[PDB]
Amino acid sequence: YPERPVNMVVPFAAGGPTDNVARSLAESMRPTLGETVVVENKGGAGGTIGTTQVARAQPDGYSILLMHAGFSTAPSLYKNPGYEPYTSFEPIGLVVDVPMTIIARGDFPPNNIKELAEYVKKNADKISLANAGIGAASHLCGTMLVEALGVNLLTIPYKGTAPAMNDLLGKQVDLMCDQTTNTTQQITSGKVKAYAVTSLKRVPTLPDLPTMDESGYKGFEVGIWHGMWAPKGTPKPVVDKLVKSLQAGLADPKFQERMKQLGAEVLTNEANPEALQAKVKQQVPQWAELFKKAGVEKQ
Numbered sequence: 001y002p003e004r005p006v007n008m009v010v011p012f013a014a015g016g017p018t019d020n021v022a023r024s025l026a027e028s029m030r031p032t033l034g035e036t037v038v039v040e041n042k043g044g045a046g047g048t049i050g051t052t053q054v055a056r057a058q059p060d061g062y063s064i065l066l067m068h069a070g071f072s073t074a075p076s077l078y079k080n081p082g083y084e085p086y087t088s089f090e091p092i093g094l095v096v097d098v099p100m101t102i103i104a105r106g107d108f109p110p111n112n113i114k115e116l117a118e119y120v121k122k123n124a125d126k127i128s129l130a131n132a133g134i135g136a137a138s139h140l141c142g143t144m145l146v147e148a149l150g151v152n153l154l155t156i157p158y159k160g161t162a163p164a165m166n167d168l169l170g171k172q173v174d175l176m177c178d179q180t181t182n183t184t185q186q187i188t189s190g191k192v193k194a195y196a197v198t199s200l201k202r203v204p205t206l207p208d209l210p211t212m213d214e215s216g217y218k219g220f221e222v223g224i225w226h227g228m229w230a231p232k233g234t235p236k237p238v239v240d241k242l243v244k245s246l247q248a249g250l251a252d253p254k255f256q257e258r259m260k261q262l263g264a265e266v267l268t269n270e271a272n273p274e275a276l277q278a279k280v281k282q283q284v285p286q287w288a289e290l291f292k293k294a295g296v297e298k299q
């Protein structure tokens, strides 16, 4: 192992934030894996369809999952998300931690986060919020945003924030929370309005955006960690090979440069099964409590 290419499933549309991470990582893992990694995009239901696909795939090491913190929210959002977060997989390791930006279409009237809150409260019924479906990173942040503002908004789900971004750029949807691996490009060129970040400290590549925390939203912190998993029952030597390849992929300079430019923190020393298992163990109950408090129930 591996004696043929390894398929890496990204549960979202090509060209978006997780796809960007996946394609860079696929390249960086190659020298150590000793085979090419082929990215497959499988969007739908906030990432649960793609996650489920890998959960049900042959445990031979030729199907692996690259998925983000939505892996941990979906079990509190769906009566049956299609997988069991603690047992459906053999965890390989953590990958990156990506902050989010609150953005709007380029001609959205407010120019800052204070004015945004005021505008959304006053004009709520005229405003659409985009996300990548229940279970997505943009869904989690969007939920937190409308809760913090005390509003209910028309909410439009997409198979990823790549198609959502298309509509935002096209002025077909108004407001979105999305990861810097997808938004940096559009923010720095001035193509979208940018209001705030969801990190505890400012994003150094986007230094003029205040955190939500410093903007008055105490504890409004969202970091979209990403993990890599194989299906339950994948042989230990195969998991071992995947761990070694992931570690080498994260330690690679080209990968790290691209991640740095996109505002992603590389979790270089946390690319091991135990770290990912611990992350999932902590995160599922954390988001469960958040949704419970927001009155957001399983469906």
Ligand SMILES: N[C@@H](CC(=O)O)C(=O)O
Pocket (backbone or CB within 6 Å): 012, 013, 016, 017, 018, 019, 068, 070, 131, 132, 135, 136, 137, 138, 139, 159, 160, 161, 162, 178
């Ligand atoms: N990470 C997703 C977007 C999201 O979950 O909000 C994507 O790659 O499209």
